[PDB]
Structures are given as structure tokens and as C-alpha cells.
Swiss-Prot record, chain A:
<keyword id="KW-0689">Ribosomal protein</keyword>
<dbReference type="InterPro" id="IPR037229">
    <property type="entry name" value="Ribosomal_bL35_sf"/>
</dbReference>
<protein>
    <recommendedName>
        <fullName>Large ribosomal subunit protein bL35</fullName>
    </recommendedName>
</protein>
<comment type="similarity">
    <text>Belongs to the bacterial ribosomal protein bL35 family.</text>
</comment>
<dbReference type="InterPro" id="IPR021137">
    <property type="entry name" value="Ribosomal_bL35-like"/>
</dbReference>
<dbReference type="InterPro" id="IPR018265">
    <property type="entry name" value="Ribosomal_bL35_CS"/>
</dbReference>
<dbReference type="GO" id="GO:0006412">
    <property type="term" value="P:translation"/>
</dbReference>
<feature type="compositionally biased region" description="Basic residues">
    <location>
        <begin position="30"/>
        <end position="43"/>
    </location>
</feature>
<dbReference type="InterPro" id="IPR001706">
    <property type="entry name" value="Ribosomal_bL35"/>
</dbReference>
From Swiss-Prot, chain B:
<dbReference type="GO" id="GO:0003735">
    <property type="term" value="F:structural constituent of ribosome"/>
</dbReference>
<dbReference type="InterPro" id="IPR011332">
    <property type="entry name" value="Ribosomal_zn-bd"/>
</dbReference>
<comment type="similarity">
    <text>Belongs to the bacterial ribosomal protein bL33 family.</text>
</comment>
<dbReference type="GO" id="GO:0006412">
    <property type="term" value="P:translation"/>
</dbReference>
<keyword id="KW-0687">Ribonucleoprotein</keyword>
<dbReference type="Pfam" id="PF00471">
    <property type="entry name" value="Ribosomal_L33"/>
</dbReference>
<dbReference type="GO" id="GO:0005737">
    <property type="term" value="C:cytoplasm"/>
</dbReference>
<dbReference type="GO" id="GO:1990904">
    <property type="term" value="C:ribonucleoprotein complex"/>
</dbReference>
<protein>
    <recommendedName>
        <fullName>Large ribosomal subunit protein bL33A</fullName>
    </recommendedName>
</protein>
Length: 59, 50
RNA sequence: AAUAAAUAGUCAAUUAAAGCAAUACGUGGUGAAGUGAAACAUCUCAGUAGCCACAGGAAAAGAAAACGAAUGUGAUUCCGUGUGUAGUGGCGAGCGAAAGCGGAACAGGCCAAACUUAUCAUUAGAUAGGGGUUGUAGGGCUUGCAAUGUGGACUUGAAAA
RNA sequence: CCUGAGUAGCUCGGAAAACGUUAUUUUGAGUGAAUCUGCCCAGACCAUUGGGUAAGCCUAAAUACUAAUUAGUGACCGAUA
RNA sequence: UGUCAGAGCACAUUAAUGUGUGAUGGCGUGCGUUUUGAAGUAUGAGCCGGCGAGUUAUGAUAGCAAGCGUUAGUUAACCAGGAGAUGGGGAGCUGUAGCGAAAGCGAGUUUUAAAAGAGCGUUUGUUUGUUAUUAUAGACCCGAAACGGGUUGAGCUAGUC
RNA sequence: AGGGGUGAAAUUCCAAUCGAAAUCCGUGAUAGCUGGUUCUCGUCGAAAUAGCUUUAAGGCUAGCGUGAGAUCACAAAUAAG
RNA sequence: UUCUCGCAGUCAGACAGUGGGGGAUAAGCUUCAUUGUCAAGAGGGGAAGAGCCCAGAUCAUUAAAUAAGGUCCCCAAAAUA
RNA sequence: UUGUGGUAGACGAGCGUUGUAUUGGAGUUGAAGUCAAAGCGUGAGCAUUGGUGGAUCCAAUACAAGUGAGAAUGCCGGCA
RNA sequence: GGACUGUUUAACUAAAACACAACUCUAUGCCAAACCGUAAGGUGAUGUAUAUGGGGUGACACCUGCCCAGUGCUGGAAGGUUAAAGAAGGAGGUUAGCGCAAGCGAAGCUUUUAACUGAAGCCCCAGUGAACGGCGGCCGUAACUAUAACGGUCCUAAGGUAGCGAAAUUCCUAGUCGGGUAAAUUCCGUCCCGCUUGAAUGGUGUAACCAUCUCUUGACUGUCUCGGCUAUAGACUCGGUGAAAUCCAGGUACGGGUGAAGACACCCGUUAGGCGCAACGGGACGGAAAGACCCCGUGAAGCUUUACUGUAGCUUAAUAUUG
RNA sequence: CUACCCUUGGUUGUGUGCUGUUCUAAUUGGUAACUGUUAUCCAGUUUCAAGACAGUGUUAGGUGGGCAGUUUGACUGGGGCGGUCGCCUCCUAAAAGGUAACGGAGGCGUACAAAGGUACCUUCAGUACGGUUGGAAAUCGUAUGUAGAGUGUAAUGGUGUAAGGGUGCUUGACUGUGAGACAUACAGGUCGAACAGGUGAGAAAUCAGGUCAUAGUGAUCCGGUGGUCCAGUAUGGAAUGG
């Protein structure tokens, strides 16, 4: 099996197996979002349980 | 969509630190507000930047 | 022969080539499409199938104008790992090494040019020999010492297993 | 004194390499160098440092395969196999 | 078109409230498929016998079990050995320290002027055997109209000579 | 002589076949579509819903099932206030 | 019926009562909310009926009491006023 | 004591076929096959006897599968 | 309707379709245009504008009207825009060097940009219809009514001319009228608001011809009123050989109802001794063909175009052969 | 008088191409002749005709269904046609929330340097009466009136000492964050206490992380711009990235 080249470059793993990710809606069209929204989307997050199983076998 | 947004940049480090809205048709004069600057860590004049 | 010479052409003698197959391996030229991307054109399929040419008992490759970042390795080939890593991708489907390390085997040789010899209406810029084969540069020019060996990818024979 | 020239480079279209063309390799068209204080390379490029000697040739072994000859084997088949 | 009761008839056994037939009474619209719903005026099979569809190779995850264990665990290629178990082979792979895009720091680290706050960490291993699922391969079996590449056909027929 | 031929032209004819022969090969093409998938017993036992989908006969996640483990009460059910 | 992990199937539903939308207070119509059954559930009543009523089949018994429903005959079971 | 309708599906426990490895055993005084019968099991299934048959087969514990046919307008053979 | 004789879908369409003699347009000066191939080579043609290729129409007779706006084709002065390529220069990277730093900075190479030159084509200007094609409305108006010769106005490139017309064309429409008949959605002639006829995708006539279409009529007849008879070969019976599709197992009634909504099989009734033979087709949603119609599939194939992306060919320029 | 820099013209002179001639030796010929050769091809030698043209190779424009590979959506009381596809408000929606139909009505893809923030002051529309232009209705005074007024907007909800109107000062329409919740398949969305920095209003308490609230919006990839305490393929830069 080959690791998907798109699964990597977008999902980093951690010590306990959580898959770190970046928030979307942070590429353009900045004036259409509030500074609260922008500063909340700047921080990183983890995949939800609904996607953890699908990303585990993808990596 | 229409583009009524404008950028406000500091006048000491010449850094752009704010994104606001402006009506070019109604308001003809450039904005000259005074806002907080992350670099200078103080309040300083921010002017409209193209 | 045209056309004087000379070539084209014609004839004779000698030596090789033709072809086949092993439903298999090698090299080179040419080279798709079904399919996947849940459509499709970049892409994939795939340099695969097929077509053709040349072999050989294997073929191909091969002795650094190299790897590559070090007080480093020192032809080519094949196996494991490095790793599904660095990367490359309408960054989509996908594709995917080169170093290094551990192993199988191990082998390095030879021409051109200089310089020189002999001969060609010697206009040689040509033929046949000696000299040379490189990188911590080599060789030639002139002048000496030490050498008669060790080893080959090497010919004929004889003997033995 | 000699050390491989329409050659290495460069431009225009392609390709090989994992790479969808790009440092390295190759070429259809055009142009075109230098000679150990020389030339090429270390992913655009320049300088320092270092590595290597292109444009000539040959090369056993480990590697790939079994139509065939001899011996033999099979938790392979036993006439719809 | 059978089943539960049931006379009469004829026999005698894997000795068993026995076996063969069944006047008569009660009840009773097949089997698979696909559908909300099939006795089906939907579908598939005339009958019998044989054959006929979840595999293999390489990896990932999880359950169960065994070996070895806290500076652990385990070898791949290859060599010897019976086409062996195995011995040599520690190249490597997983775990042992994490955080950050990265230089970097380190039981801390990223963000930030911040040590405040927040995110991630401040521990529970490895190699095999078996089972389940999954990825690449044709991947449970059968079925297209098609597409591309090569060859064979003008003895029928159409044209021309 | 077949992404070709021939056609006083009809999509005619090209070996009882022609909107583009016959045969072999890529090939076991692909099919979200039909059909089929073979021994037994025991425990438990659904859904036909929401969102997205060039999606509507398909797919992913959530909802409902099953196996293992944890949570004993503060968790979840049945009645009264 | 909450939390974690492994494996799913399901995305065509149907009817009856109740409250509505579309239709015409038509449809065994179509689209919702809710209570039930069928789907995936036999038995008894409805003469015959997937969805209505009574209920939930472990096997055997030629035992007894009952639910819906019924007691002239078919067909088990009644009499008084 | 509470239970035991059941499709898709999940989980658990078993039967049967062929062969191999270890043990033991039967067989021309008759093995497999094959037919019949009034047997034993909760189920796959398992025996006993007799006829035919003429040379291999059985039991236990493990292991490996081309391992289970009623349907595919399924293929082949035979017969209605 | 086609001029004709002919040709055509082997195996459902022989015709009004194709072809044909004839007309016209266009290209072609010969190594001709066109065509097969990749090229050689070849057809055209051992021909030479009275010749060859292609488009359209289809004897013969009379005619073929208007529009060059759009598209196509041909030609054109200059002018504007435009590729490759060449090219004056410009901007950076590096560092010899200058400078306390900072910074500046020669040549060499190297990255990139570039005025300007640069054909055809396009924009633009004319011609071209037997080239692709197109060729209108509204309002008022004459001394009975009716209608409008006539006048006004909008738009277009120009608004359909002749001829023919309820047509193989007419929706309304079985249009009105006349003829044919006792009676005529068909037929013949005529009328014209021709929704939407019309002049080389030709218009209108036309003698002869047609296994063409359509209507009336004489003779003629079993086409019919209306059915009947005869003879053979079958069918039927006997002797011999001996299939076929179909088929879950069958011992296979009718009426009303029910049910997946049209029952041999279910519920309630009625009828019916067992089994053949000859008949005829009501049913078994009878048999044969995994519906050709409809829909679905991110199915296939053929064809079309100013759908997209490409490409053979044709044409223009730079460069090499190239003075 | 001696020098440098602009507009324009002539001159001997070189450097480039641009159209225009002439020439032949490259090259071409399906002109003719001879020879190989008993030979229509081919080759050689001429002759004639062209001629640096043409043809051919490479590069680059134009035309090009002649040819090829594909695309040409979904919902739908069957399809085609018509209509719609995202977000917001009300009803259907059955007094928590949620709930469909090609059911019934409407809007949005913004606006405001003030319509934001703060401090202070202040409170309808309409109607009645009285008054030049002036009129049914402009403005003034008094009274009445409990929202029919305003709150930028489509509706709903809210709000009459408010969230409506006016004035003064300002830019919090801040920086780094963020415990805890709402709603959700995911992706995303919504509210937010509180902390640190530095500000605005106000005497202070306090308020200010855009508006009375709900529509005013688009993921990823790719490339561009500004800043930068990161990388810079031997080293120093640069290129190129983060
Ligand atoms: Mg393809
Ligand atoms: Mg595809
Ligand atoms: Mg697909
Ligand atoms: Mg060799
Ligand atoms: Mg180079
Ligand atoms: Mg490649
Ligand atoms: Mg050197
Ligand atoms: Mg470098
Ligand atoms: Mg050299
Ligand atoms: Mg055989
Ligand atoms: Mg046989
Ligand atoms: Mg009975
Ligand atoms: Mg019955
Ligand atoms: Mg079955
Ligand atoms: Mg059905
Ligand atoms: Mg149905
Ligand atoms: Mg029936
Ligand atoms: Mg049917
Ligand atoms: Mg079917
Ligand atoms: Mg059948
Ligand atoms: Mg069978
Ligand atoms: Mg395991
Ligand atoms: Mg070992
Ligand atoms: Mg912390
Ligand atoms: Mg362990
Ligand atoms: Mg013939
Ligand atoms: Mg094709
Ligand atoms: Mg046709
Ligand atoms: Mg035929
Ligand atoms: Mg198949
Ligand atoms: Mg498909
Ligand atoms: Mg149960
Ligand atoms: Mg349900
Ligand atoms: Mg529901
Ligand atoms: Mg589907
Ligand atoms: Mg699910
Ligand atoms: Mg429903
Ligand atoms: Mg529904
Ligand atoms: Mg209802
Ligand atoms: Mg209603
Ligand atoms: Mg209703
Ligand atoms: Mg219904
Ligand atoms: Mg079902
Ligand atoms: Mg029932
Ligand atoms: Mg009943
Ligand atoms: Mg029970
Ligand atoms: Mg009782
Ligand atoms: Mg009772
Ligand atoms: Mg009784
Ligand atoms: Mg059960
Ligand atoms: Mg056995
Ligand atoms: Mg026996
Ligand atoms: Mg089998
Ligand atoms: Mg005719
Ligand atoms: Mg004729
Ligand atoms: Mg015919
Ligand atoms: Mg005929
Ligand atoms: Mg030619
Ligand atoms: Mg000729
Ligand atoms: Mg004609
Ligand atoms: Mg005509
Ligand atoms: Mg005309
Ligand atoms: Mg004109
Ligand atoms: Mg022109
Ligand atoms: Mg007229
Ligand atoms: Mg007339
Ligand atoms: Mg007529
Ligand atoms: Mg009449
Ligand atoms: Mg008629
Ligand atoms: Mg008439
Ligand atoms: Mg016409
Ligand atoms: Mg015409
Ligand atoms: Mg006429
Ligand atoms: Mg005829
Ligand atoms: Mg007879
Ligand atoms: Mg007979
Ligand atoms: Mg009924
Ligand atoms: Mg069908
Ligand atoms: Mg398609
Ligand atoms: Mg396709
Ligand atoms: Mg040219
Ligand atoms: Mg010739
Ligand atoms: Mg030329
Ligand atoms: Mg071109
Ligand atoms: Mg095109
Ligand atoms: Mg096409
Ligand atoms: Mg394709
Ligand atoms: Mg549709
Ligand atoms: Mg419809
Ligand atoms: Mg309908
Ligand atoms: Mg539409
Ligand atoms: Mg509510
Ligand atoms: Mg409610
Ligand atoms: Mg409002
Ligand atoms: Mg204010
Ligand atoms: Mg306000
Ligand atoms: Mg892109
Ligand atoms: Mg560097
Ligand atoms: Zn600043």
C-alpha cells in the first residue's frame, strides 16, 4: 500500500495518534470574515471522530 | 461582488495591519485614523494604502 | 562508352551472406487502444500489446570530464534495506528514485597525437614500423641508475587426473 | 612539444531521468570555443574550496530463460480432471 | 396430491405402543429470485448425474495466544545444511521525548511583549502464529454493445480491363 | 481491401453478415445494471431517516444492529408531586 | 438508551387511527407530524384478505381456565324475562 | 430466576470430503464401491445385517485445502 | 408526377427516387487544375480551352423579377493591429576594488526585460446571385351599400415580379359555385384573407411513353345478393419408418366474491361415471424473440455544426542549402 | 575668440537590411541528343530553359468537421418544454426544538467616518383650536392622544425616557488570546465570562473587540503583493521556497 500524497502534506500525526490539521477558509476573501473569525481559524485543529477512521487507513 | 474594502497601514514601520471598508463614491478623502500597531506596540496613525 | 586519358559499365576467379526454430530470455527502431481518474482533454494504462531489424549462448552495461559533503567511497551487473522516504503530480487519480549500509562476483586492458624510421612525380595531408595511453597530471625531448623477472582475458604441442 | 572540433557550450522544438522538461544526459534546425595559470562537475547563477579528465575502442564473473538430454521429486491430476 | 384421525384387507420386523395399501372425516393456493406487497395472470428451472462462484502473493489495522523484556525485541539478502528444522549474518525496522513549517529548544515546546492563557506532551514494548476487515493486482462467478493492433478474403456481389 | 474498396446513390454491395467485413491478439476490456453464490445448530437482531453529492437504481458521514471493555449513580428508564 | 474500539446492513417502504398541506372534505392518490401492525410474525375473529381487533410460535401431550369473537344447521358452545 | 418468532446483518460452537504426519487395527475366512431393510442421534450426520463387488481401508490427535450444489434462459452426457 | 429507352435497396419499399441527352456557373496555359501515396510513381492524357475537373438544373417551347445589408468568393491604394525571428539599450546576481562601519562598486560571466524592424491574415474600401440566402406593416379615402384606384406614415439591404393557385403545398376546411351520381370527405373546372406558392434546391405548358398514382365509364364475369355441385392431392382408416418447439410436480369444471387490483387450485354455492376419437379455436394474461415504442445508464456507435481541444492538407514569413 | 548640448540640409565614407535590375558557377526540369544499351526507367556527358528563384529541412502565424478524441447537468405526480438550483423572514408546523411537496407570500449578493464608541440633554405620528403670503396637508403656540411614529432595508420579533432625535469629544469598525456553551454527519457557523498591552468617552462607577437582531456570501489547488528573528543542496551570497 502507498500513502496518499494528498493525505500527507495536509495531516500531521502526534504522540497519541491524533491527526493535526489546518482550518479552511484562510486563503482569500479576507474582508468577508470578521477578525474574530480570522483569529479563530488561524489556530490548528484535529480531525473529528467521523473522519479519524477514514484518515487512519489513508496515512 | 462589489469591492468596498480598503487597507490601513501604519506610518512608522509602513506595515499594513488593518482591513476596513470605505465608499469611494461617498467619502472622497483618504482615511487617517489612529489605531494600535503590533510592531511599535503603541497607538499610531494608520493611513489608507492602495 | 559518351570523350584523348580515365571512370561508369561488362566478364572471369576466390571468399562469405542468405533460411529456419526454443509459444523462452537480450538489444534497438516504431508504437496504440480497452481501462482508471467514478464524465474527460493534461495524466494513467505504457514505453505494455503489436510490427520490424540484429544476435548470442547469454545479451546489454562498464573502468569516472563519477557520487557527493566528508581527515569519505573508488568499473559494470544482480539481491535486501534505505521507504512507499526526498520529491514529482488537472498537487487529482497516481508515480517514485539517487546517496549510504549489508551481500553475490571481482580485472583491467588497448589505440590518436606528439618524437622517430622507410617508401610513395614524396606538393603526403598517404602506407608500413619503433614510442604512448594519463589526473596525488601523464607522455614525448636530452642525460643516468636498476632490471632480466612476475603476471595475463594469451598459440601450439606433450603428459596426467 | 602532444593529450581525441562542426566537438563541448548557446538558441529554437522534443525527449531520458522518480520528475509533467530542469541543474545532469540525449538531438531535428542554426551558430559555435579554449588548450594544464587549460576544460567539465558539486540542482538556476557568480566567487572561494574541492572532485574529475568529455568529444576513441575492447572487456570474463556474479544476472535472465528452458524447446531438448540423464537421474529424481511432489500433503500435484487420475479419463467432465 | 400432502397432513392429523380412521375401518377393512395382506403380511411378519435392525421386536419395535410392527410393516404395506388407504373406504371415510377435519385442515390445506409449490421451491428459489426480486419486491411495500408474489399461489401468481411477474420471473428461473422438462427430469437425472457429474462440473460450476470468496483464492493467492505483498503490506496496514484490530481481536485472541505464545516467545523475549525494561539501554528491550527481531532479523532481510547471503553462506553451510537433506529442494530441511536450524547456525552464522545486527544492514536495518519498531519502541525508548516531545513540540514546532523550520533553524531550534528540550520534560518541555509552539503562539505571543508574556513565563499569563491556550494547543501538544510530561509513557507503556517488540517478534511471530490464528482470525476479521482493508490496499495493489482480473480479486466472488457469469454477461455486453464496443475500442485499438495485426493478418485472411473481389470463386457471391459492385466497378474497370 | 476495411477510420478502405465499389456504387446510373438505396446506407447498395464487398462469401446466406455491413451506419462500416471475417479472424486472431491487447483481453479474464469495463458494466454504480440483471442473474447466481454450495453444510448445521445456538444467542442477539435492524433500516427504508437527516446532510452533502453531474447526485436521485450509486457513494460518504450521522441515526438504528452486533461483539468486547468501562462507568453503580451523580447514568438511563417506569410512576407520583 | 452514556463513553471507547472491531464488523456491518439500511438511503424504493405499505396500510389503519388521529392533526394538517396539495387534490375537488376524490382516489388502494401525493407530501408531512404522531401512535401501531406488516416488512422481518405464525395462531384466533373478520366467509375468503401482509397492514383492522385479540396476542407474540423452544419441542411433545387426544389435559384445564380464558382474550377478541360467538352459541338454529353448515361449525365448538344458552338459557330464562 | 429471567428467557429461547425472525429477513439484512454481528457473534459463538460443531458436522462432513480428500490428502499428509504420528500412533494402533481390519481385510480373498472378502476392503472400497453399490443396492435393500420395520435402526441411532438436537442438526449437519452415524451405524448393523444381507445381496452384488473383487483389493484396499478404518479409529484417535494435529496440519493443508481445487472441501460441501436446487436454481445462474448455467456447461457436458443420458432419458422423458 | 417523371420528357423518353434505362438504373436502384441480393432476401418486405421499382417509385414521383437515381441516371440520361440538354442549360449554366466555376477552376484549369500544360511539369495544367483535380486525384491515389508519405514519397517515388500514376490517372487526368500519349489529351491541349471546340480540352479537362467540380457545383447546380434536367427533353422541347416561353420565361427566370428585386436585394451585395450578413455570409462566401474575387480584387484593392495607402492607413491601424499582429507571430516567430533579429535587435539600440535597461534592470538585477556575483566580486577585483574603494571605504571606520554603512554603503558604493570595474571587467568577466550570468538572470531577465526591451524601443525598433517584422509577411500573410484581421479592421477598412469596391464588385460579385443560374454564389450561402432574403424578398413587410398601420391609418384614412369615390354621391345607395360594399371595396379602395388614391393619400399619409414607421422600418428594412430590398419588402414576392411574371406565372400558377384549397396544389404531392390550405390550418380553419367535408371552403363557395358548376359538372359527373337517386344520393359524391374522392374526381374535373372556377373563384383567391396563398396562416406558410413562386421563378435554375427553377416557374408555367407540353405530342409520345409508364408492371407509376388518381377518378368516371362500355363489355365482362361467383368480387357480391348467396350459396351449391363435381374430380383429384391431402386431412381421415389400415401396414412400415418416425421428428418439432414446450414442459416446477399435477389426479387440471362453472357462477358470485376475494386477492399483487382480470383465479383449474382461495371462500361460499352449483354441476360433473372412467378413458378415447374426429373437429373449431374461447382461456391457460398460450408458444417462439432477457420490448424494437417510453424511461434510466455520469452506456456504445453513425452523422452534423460558428460546441471544445487538436491535426492531415493549403497559404505566408524567418533561417540553411545560397553566390 | 576657444569648448559642450538641441531642429534641419549636403558631402566624400563605412554597418545593416528594403524593394529594382543584370550575370552564372550552386540548384531545378515530365526540352532535345549521345552512351551504358537490342532499354519509354535509371546513371553519366552535353544542349536548351530557368536560376540564387524554386524545391526541400527547422521554426512561427492564418485558414482548415477533410479527419480524430470527447462533452452536451439534476429536480420532475413518466420524458421533452416551461420553472427552479446559494442565503434570510413569515405561514403550513399540530403553544419546547425539528419537520416535506413544481405548497402560500416576500427579499438578499448591502449601507453607514456616521446610521460606530462614549458623556450629556431630550421624546411620538395624527387630530382639535387660534394665525400673512400659505392653499386639505410646509412652519408656530396650546391641548388631546397611549403607538397607528421612528428604529437605512423583505418580513418577523423587540423597543414609546428605550435600541428614537440632537450636541461635544473621539476611532474599541483595537493587538495576543480565550474557560464555558448553542447548533451540528463532516467542513463550517453562533454567543461569550475573564486575562495581558496600549487607548477613546466620562468627575467616577462603568461602557467600547462595529451597528435593535436575524440575509449582504465561495472550500481546495495555482499564481501575485507587503512584512519577516526560518531554510539557502560543499562554503559566502543569490535563485527559490517557508
Ligand atoms: Mg484514454
Ligand atoms: Mg473514466
Ligand atoms: Mg467509471
Ligand atoms: Mg558484451
Ligand atoms: Mg553544463
Ligand atoms: Mg518520462
Ligand atoms: Mg587541473
Ligand atoms: Mg551548489
Ligand atoms: Mg582528455
Ligand atoms: Mg481429456
Ligand atoms: Mg466421459
Ligand atoms: Mg384427506
Ligand atoms: Mg386445496
Ligand atoms: Mg439458495
Ligand atoms: Mg418488481
Ligand atoms: Mg412493483
Ligand atoms: Mg395459477
Ligand atoms: Mg411478462
Ligand atoms: Mg426479471
Ligand atoms: Mg421457464
Ligand atoms: Mg442439473
Ligand atoms: Mg495480530
Ligand atoms: Mg535464519
Ligand atoms: Mg501549559
Ligand atoms: Mg507480549
Ligand atoms: Mg465482376
Ligand atoms: Mg477511432
Ligand atoms: Mg436514409
Ligand atoms: Mg451478403
Ligand atoms: Mg467477464
Ligand atoms: Mg462504464
Ligand atoms: Mg429476539
Ligand atoms: Mg420504520
Ligand atoms: Mg422517518
Ligand atoms: Mg445508479
Ligand atoms: Mg452507516
Ligand atoms: Mg414516509
Ligand atoms: Mg416517500
Ligand atoms: Mg393517513
Ligand atoms: Mg387533506
Ligand atoms: Mg390528507
Ligand atoms: Mg399510497
Ligand atoms: Mg425488503
Ligand atoms: Mg398474522
Ligand atoms: Mg381468518
Ligand atoms: Mg417466544
Ligand atoms: Mg370455559
Ligand atoms: Mg366473552
Ligand atoms: Mg353445534
Ligand atoms: Mg432465535
Ligand atoms: Mg481423513
Ligand atoms: Mg458391501
Ligand atoms: Mg468447489
Ligand atoms: Mg420515368
Ligand atoms: Mg421503364
Ligand atoms: Mg427488396
Ligand atoms: Mg418488389
Ligand atoms: Mg507528383
Ligand atoms: Mg499519358
Ligand atoms: Mg433534379
Ligand atoms: Mg423539375
Ligand atoms: Mg433568381
Ligand atoms: Mg459591398
Ligand atoms: Mg478578401
Ligand atoms: Mg401572384
Ligand atoms: Mg390563374
Ligand atoms: Mg386532389
Ligand atoms: Mg360539388
Ligand atoms: Mg386515396
Ligand atoms: Mg380542381
Ligand atoms: Mg420551393
Ligand atoms: Mg433559386
Ligand atoms: Mg404545372
Ligand atoms: Mg413504371
Ligand atoms: Mg392418396
Ligand atoms: Mg400410420
Ligand atoms: Mg378487490
Ligand atoms: Mg429487458
Ligand atoms: Mg456519456
Ligand atoms: Mg466512456
Ligand atoms: Mg516556405
Ligand atoms: Mg516521369
Ligand atoms: Mg531558396
Ligand atoms: Mg503550423
Ligand atoms: Mg474544428
Ligand atoms: Mg466529430
Ligand atoms: Mg476514452
Ligand atoms: Mg432526469
Ligand atoms: Mg412531466
Ligand atoms: Mg403520472
Ligand atoms: Mg430546461
Ligand atoms: Mg414549534
Ligand atoms: Mg409541538
Ligand atoms: Mg421593518
Ligand atoms: Mg454621537
Ligand atoms: Mg445606534
Ligand atoms: Mg489550476
Ligand atoms: Mg549554497
Ligand atoms: Zn508601526
Amino acid at each position: 500500500m502507498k500513502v496518499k500524497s494528498a493525505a500527507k502534506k495536509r495531516f500531521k500525526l502526534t504522540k497519541s495518534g491524533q491527526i493535526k490539521r489546518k482550518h479552511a477558509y484562510t486563503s482569500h476573501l479576507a474582508p468577508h470574515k470578521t477578525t474574530k473569525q480570522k483569529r479563530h481559524l488561524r489556530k490548528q485543529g484535529t480531525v473529528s471522530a467521523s473522519d479519524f477512521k477514514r484518515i487512519g487507513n489513508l496515512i | 461582488a462589489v469591492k468596498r474594502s480598503t487597507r490601513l497601514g501604519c506610518n512608522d514601520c509602513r506595515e499594513i495591519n488593518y482591513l476596513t471598508f470605505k465608499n469611494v463614491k461617498k467619502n472622497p478623502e483618504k482615511l487617517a485614523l489612529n489605531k494600535f500597531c503590533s510592531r511599535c506596540r503603541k497607538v499610531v496613525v494608520h493611513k489608507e494604502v492602495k
